[PDB]
Scaffold this motif. Structure first.
Motif, mmCIF file in Angstrom:
data_model
loop_
_atom_site.group_PDB
_atom_site.id
_atom_site.type_symbol
_atom_site.label_atom_id
_atom_site.label_comp_id
_atom_site.label_asym_id
_atom_site.label_seq_id
_atom_site.Cartn_x
_atom_site.Cartn_y
_atom_site.Cartn_z
ATOM 1 N N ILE A 95 0.832 -1.221 0.000
ATOM 2 C CA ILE A 95 0.000 0.000 0.000
ATOM 3 C C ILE A 95 0.865 1.270 0.000
ATOM 4 N N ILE A 96 1.101 1.799 -1.201
ATOM 5 C CA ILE A 96 1.615 3.155 -1.409
ATOM 6 C C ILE A 96 0.420 4.105 -1.529
ATOM 7 N N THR A 102 -2.661 10.974 -10.140
ATOM 8 C CA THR A 102 -1.525 10.046 -10.228
ATOM 9 C C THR A 102 -1.957 8.602 -10.535
ATOM 10 N N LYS A 103 -3.222 8.268 -10.288
ATOM 11 C CA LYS A 103 -3.792 6.991 -10.730
ATOM 12 C C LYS A 103 -4.030 6.991 -12.236
ATOM 13 N N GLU A 104 -4.520 8.108 -12.767
ATOM 14 C CA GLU A 104 -4.783 8.237 -14.203
ATOM 15 C C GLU A 104 -3.490 8.119 -15.018
ATOM 16 N N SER A 115 -1.589 -0.156 -4.595
ATOM 17 C CA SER A 115 -1.435 1.206 -4.073
ATOM 18 C C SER A 115 -2.800 1.868 -3.834
ATOM 19 N N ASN A 116 -2.991 2.440 -2.642
ATOM 20 C CA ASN A 116 -4.276 3.052 -2.259
ATOM 21 C C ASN A 116 -4.488 4.423 -2.888
ATOM 22 N N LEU A 117 -5.731 4.691 -3.283
ATOM 23 C CA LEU A 117 -6.128 5.971 -3.868
ATOM 24 C C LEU A 117 -6.894 6.777 -2.825
ATOM 25 N N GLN A 118 -6.532 8.049 -2.649
ATOM 26 C CA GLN A 118 -7.285 8.943 -1.758
ATOM 27 C C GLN A 118 -6.975 10.426 -1.985
ATOM 28 N N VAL A 119 -8.016 11.206 -2.290
ATOM 29 C CA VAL A 119 -7.983 12.673 -2.171
ATOM 30 C C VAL A 119 -9.302 13.218 -1.632
ATOM 31 N N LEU B 18 7.219 5.725 -7.447
ATOM 32 C CA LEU B 18 6.063 6.245 -6.726
ATOM 33 C C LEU B 18 6.342 6.365 -5.248
ATOM 34 N N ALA B 19 7.078 5.403 -4.707
ATOM 35 C CA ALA B 19 7.414 5.395 -3.286
ATOM 36 C C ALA B 19 8.389 6.508 -2.915
ATOM 37 N N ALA B 20 9.319 6.790 -3.823
ATOM 38 C CA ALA B 20 10.280 7.889 -3.664
ATOM 39 C C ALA B 20 9.627 9.268 -3.734
#
Ligand SMILES: [Mg+2]
Ligand SMILES: [Mg+2]
Ligand SMILES: [Mg+2]
Ligand SMILES: [Mg+2]
Ligand SMILES: [Mg+2]
Ligand SMILES: [Mg+2]
Ligand SMILES: [Mg+2]
Lengths: 129, 208, 83, 71, 129, 98, 83, 23, 218
Positions: A95-96, A102-104, A115-119, B18-20
Motif C-alpha cells: 500500500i503506497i 496520479t492513478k490516471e 497502491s491506495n487511492l485517496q484525495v 512512486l514510493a520515492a
RNA sequence: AGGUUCGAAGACGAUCAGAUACCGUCGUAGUUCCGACCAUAAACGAUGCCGACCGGCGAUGCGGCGGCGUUAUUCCCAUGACCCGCCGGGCAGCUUCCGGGAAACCAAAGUCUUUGGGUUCCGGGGGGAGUAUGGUUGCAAAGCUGAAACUUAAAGGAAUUGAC
RNA sequence: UCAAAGUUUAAG
C-alpha cells in the motif's frame, strides 16, 4: 585583546595534526617537544606558539570533527557510516499512497498495482500575498 | 531510449518511483518543462509523465555510455542530497565526481590544480549546480541534469524530469541511471535484479 | 517552443484562444432551443441574447440579458445540439 | 521618420531645401552677409595702403608681440 | 495601419528565422505573398508552405529550414529599367553569386535572373539571400 | 543620467497627484513621493508603564496607543536617518527592513 | 565551395547545427556534438555504433537544446513516441 | 542661472520697448 | 621545451591532430599558445598596430601602463588580433602576441564574379562592429587590392584577402576598436551560411573521441 | 462677489563683517467663487502617432467565459465575498546572452551597412540668441514667427580610477 | 530631533 594566530602558525599546526595525530595530546608541554622533534621550527617562540594551537585543535577534535583537516581514522569511520544499507524504504510496505490524478497516470501507462487511492483537499489558496 | 520491448517500463521500477515521490514535481512550472507533465492536482502540485521521465533517463544513459573513457564523465552535486548519490554513481559507473563547492574555473583555467576537461556533465539541480553548467559553455561540455518542474533549462542538453528537491527521489534517480549505464554495456543482466540497494544512494539527515 | 504544428493544433488549446486569433476564426456562441414549463412551444434563443425573449404564447419571459450570456429564468431547460 | 513614398519627391526635396540653411557652411555661401563683410570683396588678395605699424599682443598661453600693419 | 501586407509577412518570416523557428504563421495573406514565397521556395530558401483558407483574407503557415539569412522588401515598389537592375543588385544583395531581387513584371512575379533571361524590367518587390 | 527607473515617485499613469506638506520641514511634496512611516506606539512607553499600572484605578487596564501617519519629504527623511542611501544595485530592493 | 573548374577549395567545411541549419562557428565554444548509443534490440546492451547530434551554442543559451535533442531522437527512432 | 538670465533679458527688452516708444 | 596542460595540446604535441583545421571544425578552444605556433611555424608574422599608454589616477601621482595591439597572420587564411596591457612595453607586446596566436581564426576567402583561379576577396559583404566603430567589407574584383584605411588594410593583408572594398563608420580613430571591428568582420566570413554550404553535414568523431585510448596515456 | 488660512511686495526682530537672504513676528497683492483674457511649465516616460512581428514568470484594474469547495440566508434557489484557471484589452513589475545600444539602460530605445510598413514634426560644434529686426496676436505681462556681424577649439554625453 | 564658517600667484 591582541593575540590572534597568523596563518604561519595555523597552517603548520594543521599539517602537524594531519601527519602526527597519534603523537599529539592534550598536555601542552609533551607535544611542545613533539613539535620540536617532527618539524624544523627555526625559532623557539614560533614552535611554542604552534604547539599552543596544536593543543587547541586537539581539544576541538576530541569533540566532533574539524572542517579544514583530514584525520585518517575519522575518514575511514565516515566511509563506514555513509555506506550503510537498511532493509529498504523504497518498497514502502504494501500500500503506497496515491491520488486519482496520479492513478490516471498509471492508467495511461497501463498499470494496476498495489497502491491506495485517496484525495479530498479542495483548492485551498497557496501562500498569502 | 527505444521503449520498445526490453528496456521498457515494468511494474517494480514504477512502484519504486512512486514510493520515492519522484512524480510529485513542484508548484511552479517552467515553460521549458511543460513537455514533461501530465497534470496539476488540487493545492497545486504538478505531476510528471513517468514514461517521459524514463525516456529521458534512458537517453541520458545512452549519452553516458557513448563517452568512451568513463572517467571523463563528470558528476556534480552542490546540494547535500546528491552529494552522496553522485559519489556512489561515480563509484559504480567509473566516472569522476564533484561533491559540493564546485571551484570556479575547474573546466576553465589550464593553470589550476583541479583543472579537469571532461566530455560530459551530470548535474543534480541546474538551479543549484549552476557554476559548472556555465563553465560548460566555455568548454564544449554537454550536460545531463535532474530537473524539477521549476528548473530552467539553460545549457542542460538533456534534462530528466524528476523531483530533485527530495533526497529519496534524487538518490533513486542516480541509482536508476547507474543501473542503466551499467545495463547498457556491462555486468548487469536486466533479467536478474541488481545487488545494490537504492537506499545506498540516499542522503542521511543526522539520525542515529 | 522551437516546434509547434500550427496546422494541427489540439482542441484543448483552441478553446483557450480568442475567437479571432484561432487558426480559423470561429464563434464562441451557440443557439439554444428553450423549453419553459407552462407553454409547450419551444423557442430558439441565442446564447448571447441581449433582448428580453418573450415566449410564443407570450405569457412568461425566458431570458434576462446580461453582459455575457443570457440569464434563463429559473425553470427553463434547453438544448445545444446543433452545427 | 522619413517621407519615403513614391509621389513624395516634392515634400522630400523641399524639406532638404529648408534644412540646408542650418548647414552653417551653406548659409555662409548663399546669403550675402559674408561677401558684404569680407573686406576682400570676394577676392583672394587685396592691395591696400599701410597707415600704421601696430603691435598685436599674442593670446594668453603664448607671450609675444606680433608686429602687424594697419592697412 | 496595415498598409503593405507583403512587407509585414516577409519581416515576420525573417523574425521567425532569426529566432530558430521551425514553422511560422503569417496572418493577412495575399496573391503576391504566395507568389513571393513560391519564388523563395524554387531556390530552396524555404520549405513547402500551406495556406489556411478561412472564408476571408486568408492565412499561411511556412516550413522554414534555417537557410534564409534575410528576407526583405523594398517600398516604394520602384520601377527598375533593366539597366538599373545591375545597380540595384550591387547595392542590395550581398554578392554577385547568391541572393535574388524578386521583381514583378508584365510576365509575372520573379527573381531578377528570370527577368533578365526573359529580358524584362518592372517593379521591384523585395529580396532574399 | 536617470538614477531610478521609477523616479523616486510612485506615479505611473496619472499625470498629477495631490501634494502633502511634510511633517517636519513643512515642505510641499507629492503624496506618491515622500517617505511615510505609520507609527503606532504606546502613549506611556517602557519607563513609566509600570508606574502608571501601579497607580491605576481600573483593574489590569490595557493602555491606549498613539497612532500617527507621518509624511517625511526626502530632505527631512535623509537628515533624520529615516532613509540612508544605497549602492547602485541595493537601491533596487524595495522590500522594507525588519 | 568549388571553383569554375570544379576543384574544391576552402580550408574546411563547417559543422552545422542539427536543430537550426545555422553554422557552428570556429570559436562557438558553447557548442555540442552529443553522442548517443544504440542498442542491439534483443538485449539492450550497447552495440558499437552511434547517433550524433550537433547543437549551436545559441540554441543552448536560449534554452531549447533538450527539446531539440529530444525531437532529433524521436525522428531517428532513438526515442519511442512520448504520447 | 538660465532662469534669471531670461528674467534679466525680459526686463531689458521691457526697457527697450519703453525707449523706442518715446520715438 | 613544451609540456602541455591541455588535453588538446597533448594530442597536438604527439602528432595526432594533423592540422588546426581539425581543431577549428570541432570548435575546441586553443588555450596552449604552442599548438598554434607548431601548426603555423613560420609564415605567421607579428605586427604591432598600436601601443597606447593608458593610465589610472592614484593618491600618489598616476599609474601608467602600456596596451599593445598586435595582429598576426600567415598571409594565407588565418589572423589573430591580440591586446595585452602591462607595466613595461616589452612584456605587453610579448603577451599580446601570444593572445593573438591564441585567438587566431580562419578566414573564408571567395571569388568576385567569375569563379576562376584561387579565391582572392571576401565571400559576401560581411560586416563587423565593435563599440561604435563599424566596418563593412565589400568583395571586389581582381587587382583592386585592399581599398581601405591603414588598420584594416594591415589585418586584411595578413588574413591573405587580396582584394577588398571597405567601409567604416563611428570613431575609427580609436584604433584598437577599429581593429577589433575589422577582426569581427573577417571572423564572420566562416559564419555566413551561403548556398555554397547547404549540403547536410557529415559529423566526424572529434579528436577527444578518436584518441581517447591515447589520452589515457600508456 | 468674497476675504479663514497662508503669503510675492512691504515693515520690524534676529543671525552675519555685511543679509536689503536663509530663522522669527506681522502683513499688501494674490490664495477662494462667478464672468471675460492669457497660452506658457522639467506641460517629462525629457521617448511623435498608426501598424505588424520577436522570451519567460508572477501579480494587479475592468469585462467576459469555465471550474470543487468555503462563507452563508432561511430549507434549497438567485447570491454577492472568497478560492483556482482561461480569454480580451489597461496601469506597471520582476526576469535573461531576444536583439539593441557611447553607455547608463531599453521586450523596447528590438526586428538598422543583412540599411526602404505608413506618415507628421524636428536637429546639424560651442557662443552671440530665442537676441536684433520686421510681421502678427495680446488691455497688459508677454506669445508665436525670427536673423546677422562678431567671437570661439572645443562645449557636451556616458562610464572608470582617484581626490574632495 | 539642523547656531557661524567667506576667499585662495600674473609669477609657468
Ligand atoms: Mg505634470
Ligand atoms: Mg520671513
Ligand atoms: Mg490668480
Ligand atoms: Mg515650450
Ligand atoms: Mg533612437
Ligand atoms: Mg536606415
Ligand atoms: Mg549651432
Amino acid at each position: 585583546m591582541g593575540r590572534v594566530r597568523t596563518k604561519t602558525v595555523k597552517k603548520a599546526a594543521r599539517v602537524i595534526i594531519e601527519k602526527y595525530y597519534t603523537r599529539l595530546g592534550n598536555d601542552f608541554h609533551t607535544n611542545k617537544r613533539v613539535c620540536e622533534e617532527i618539524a624544523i621550527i627555526p625559532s623557539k617562540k614560533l614552535r611554542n606558539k604552534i604547539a599552543g594551537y596544536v593543543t587547541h585543535l586537539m581539544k576541538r577534535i576530541q569533540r566532533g570533527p574539524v572542517r579544514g583537516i583530514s584525520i585518517k581514522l575519522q575518514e575511514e569511520e565516515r566511509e563506514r557510516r555513509d555506506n550503510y544499507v537498511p532493509e529498504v524504504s523504497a518498497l514502502d510496505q504494501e500500500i503506497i499512497e496515491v491520488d486519482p490524478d496520479t492513478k490516471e497516470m498509471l492508467k495511461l501507462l497501463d498499470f494496476g498495482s498495489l497502491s491506495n487511492l485517496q484525495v479530498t483537499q479542495p483548492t485551498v489558496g497557496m501562500n498569502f500575498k | 531510449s527505444g521503449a520498445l520491448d526490453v528496456l521498457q517500463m515494468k511494474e517494480e521500477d514504477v512502484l519504486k518511483f512512486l514510493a520515492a515521490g519522484t512524480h510529485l514535481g513542484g508548484t511552479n512550472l517552467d515553460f521549458q518543462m511543460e513537455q514533461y507533465i501530465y497534470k496539476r492536482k488540487s493545492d497545486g502540485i504538478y505531476i510528471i509523465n513517468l514514461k517521459r521521465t524514463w525516456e529521458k533517463l534512458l537517453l541520458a544513459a545512452r549519452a553516458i555510455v557513448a563517452i568512451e573513457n568513463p572517467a571523463d564523465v563528470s558528476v556534480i552535486s552542490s546540494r547535500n542530497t546528491g552529494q552522496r548519490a553522485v559519489l556512489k554513481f561515480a563509484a559504480a559507473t567509473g566516472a569522476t565526481p564533484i561533491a559540493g563547492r564546485f571551484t570556479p574555473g575547474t573546466f576553465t583555467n589550464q593553470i589550476q590544480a583541479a583543472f579537469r576537461e571532461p566530455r560530459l556533465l551530470v548535474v543534480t539541480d541546474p538551479r543549484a549546480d549552476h557554476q559548472p553548467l556555465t563553465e560548460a559553455s566555455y568548454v564544449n561540455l554537454p550536460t545531463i541534469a535532474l530537473c524539477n518542474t521549476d528548473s530552467p533549462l539553460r545549457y542542460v542538453d538533456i534534462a530528466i524530469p524528476c523531483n530533485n528537491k527530495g533526497a529519496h527521489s534524487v538518490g533513486l534517480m542516480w541509482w536508476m541511471l547507474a543501473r542503466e549505464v551499467l545495463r547498457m554495456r556491462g555486468t548487469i543482466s536486466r533479467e536478474h535484479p541488481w545487488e545494490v540497494m537504492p537506499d545506498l544512494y540516499f542522503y542521511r539527515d543526522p539520525e542515529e | 517552443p522551437l516546434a509547434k504544428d500550427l496546422l494541427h493544433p489540439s482542441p484543448e488549446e483552441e478553446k483557450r484562444k480568442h475567437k479571432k486569433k484561432r487558426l480559423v476564426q470561429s464563434p464562441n456562441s451557440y443557439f439554444m432551443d428553450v423549453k419553459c414549463p407552462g407553454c409547450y412551444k419551444i423557442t430558439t434563443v441565442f446564447s448571447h441574447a441581449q433582448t428580453v425573449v418573450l415566449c410564443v404564447g407570450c405569457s412568461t419571459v425566458l431570458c434576462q440579458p446580461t453582459g455575457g450570456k443570457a440569464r434563463l429564468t429559473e425553470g427553463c431547460s434547453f438544448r445545444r445540439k446543433q452545427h | 521618420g522619413k517621407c519615403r513614398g513614391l509621389r513624395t519627391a516634392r515634400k522630400l526635396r523641399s524639406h532638404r531645401r529648408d534644412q540646408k540653411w542650418h548647414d552653417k557652411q551653406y548659409k555662409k555661401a548663399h546669403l550675402g552677409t559674408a561677401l558684404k563683410a569680407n573686406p576682400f570683396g570676394g577676392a583672394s588678395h587685396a592691395k591696400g595702403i599701410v597707415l600704421e605699424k601696430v603691435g598685436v599682443e599674442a593670446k594668453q598661453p603664448n607671450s609675444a608681440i606680433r608686429k602687424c600693419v594697419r592697412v | 495601419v496595415r498598409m503593405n501586407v507583403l512587407a509585414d509577412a516577409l519581416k515576420s518570416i525573417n523574425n521567425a528565422e532569426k529566432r530558430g523557428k521551425r514553422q511560422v504563421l503569417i496572418r493577412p495573406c495575399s496573391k503576391v505573398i504566395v507568389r513571393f514565397l513560391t519564388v523563395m521556395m524554387k531556390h530552396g530558401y524555404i520549405g513547402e508552405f500551406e495556406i489556411i483558407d478561412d472564408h476571408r483574407a486568408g492565412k499561411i503557415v511556412v516550413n522554414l529550414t534555417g537557410r534564409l539569412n534575410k528576407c526583405g522588401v523594398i517600398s516604394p515598389r520602384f520601377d527598375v529599367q533593366l539597366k538599373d537592375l545591375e545597380k540595384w543588385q550591387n547595392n542590395l544583395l550581398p554578392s554577385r553569386q547568391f541572393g535574388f531581387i524578386v521583381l514583378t513584371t508584365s510576365a509575372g512575379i520573379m527573381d531578377h535572373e528570370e527577368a533578365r533571361r526573359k529580358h524584362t524590367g518592372g517593379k521591384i518587390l523585395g529580396f532574399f539571400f | 543620467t536617470k538614477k531610478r527607473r521609477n523616479n523616486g515617485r510612485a506615479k505611473k499613469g496619472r499625470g498629477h497627484v495631490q501634494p502633502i506638506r511634510c511633517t517636519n520641514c513643512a515642505r510641499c511634496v507629492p503624496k506618491d513621493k515622500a517617505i511615510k512611516k505609520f507609527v503606532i506606539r504606546n502613549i506611556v512607553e517602557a519607563a513609566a508603564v509600570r508606574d502608571i499600572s501601579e497607580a491605576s484605578v481600573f483593574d489590569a487596564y490595557v493602555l491606549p496607543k498613539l497612532y500617527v501617519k507621518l509624511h517625511y519629504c526626502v530632505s527631512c527623511a535623509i537628515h533624520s536617518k529615516v532613509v540612508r542611501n544605497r549602492s547602485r544595485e541595493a537601491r533596487k530592493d524595495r522590500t522594507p527592513p525588519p | 565551395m568549388q571553383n569554375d573548374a570544379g576543384e574544391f577549395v576552402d580550408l574546411y567545411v563547417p559543422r552545422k547545427c542539427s536543430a537550426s541549419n545555422r553554422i557552428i562557428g570556429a570559436k562557438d565554444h558553447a557548442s555540442i556534438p552529443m553522442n548517443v548509443a544504440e542498442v542491439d534490440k534483443v538485449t539492450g546492451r550497447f552495440n558499437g555504433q552511434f547517433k550524433t547530434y550537433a547543437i549551436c551554442g545559441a540554441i543552448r543559451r536560449m534554452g531549447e537544446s533538450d527539446d531539440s535533442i529530444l525531437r532529433l531522437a524521436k525522428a531517428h527512432g532513438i526515442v519511442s513516441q512520448n504520447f | 542661472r538660465a532662469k534669471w538670465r531670461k528674467k534679466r533679458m525680459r526686463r531689458l527688452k521691457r526697457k527697450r520697448r519703453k525707449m523706442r516708444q518715446r520715438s | 621545451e613544451w609540456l602541455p596542460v591541455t588535453k588538446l595540446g597533448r594530442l597536438v604535441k604527439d602528432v595526432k591532430i594533423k592540422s588546426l583545421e581539425e581543431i577549428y571544425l570541432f570548435s575546441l578552444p586553443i588555450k596552449e599558445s604552442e599548438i598554434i605556433d607548431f601548426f603555423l611555424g613560420a609564415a605567421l608574422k607579428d605586427e604591432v598596430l598600436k601601443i597606447m599608454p593608458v593610465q589610472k589616477q592614484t593618491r600618489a601621482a598616476q599609474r601608467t601602463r602600456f596596451k599593445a595591439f598586435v595582429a598576426i597572420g600567415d598571409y594565407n587564411g588565418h589572423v589573430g588580433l591580440g591586446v595585452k596591457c602591462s607595466k613595461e612595453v616589452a612584456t605587453a607586446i610579448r603577451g599580446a602576441i601570444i593572445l593573438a596566436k591564441l585567438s587566431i581564426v580562419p578566414v573564408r576567402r571567395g571569388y568576385w564574379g567569375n569563379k576562376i583561379g584561387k579565391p582572392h576577396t571576401v565571400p559576401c559583404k560581411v560586416t563587423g562592429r565593435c563599440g561604435s566603430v563599424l566596418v563593412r567589407l565589400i568583395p571586389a574584383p581582381r587587382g583592386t587590392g585592399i581599398v581601405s584605411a591603414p588598420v584594416p588594410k594591415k589585418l586584411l593583408l595578413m588574413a591573405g584577402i587580396d582584394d577588398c572594398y571597405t567601409s567604416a563608420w563611428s570613431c575609427t580613430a580609436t584604433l584598437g576598436n577599429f581593429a577589433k571591428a575589422t577582426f569581427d568582420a573577417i571572423s564572420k566570413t566562416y559564419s555566413y551560411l551561403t548556398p555554397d554550404l547547404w549540403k547536410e553535414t557529415v559529423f566526424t568523431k572529434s579528436p577527444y573521441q578518436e584518441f581517447t585510448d591515447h589520452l589515457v596515456k600508456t
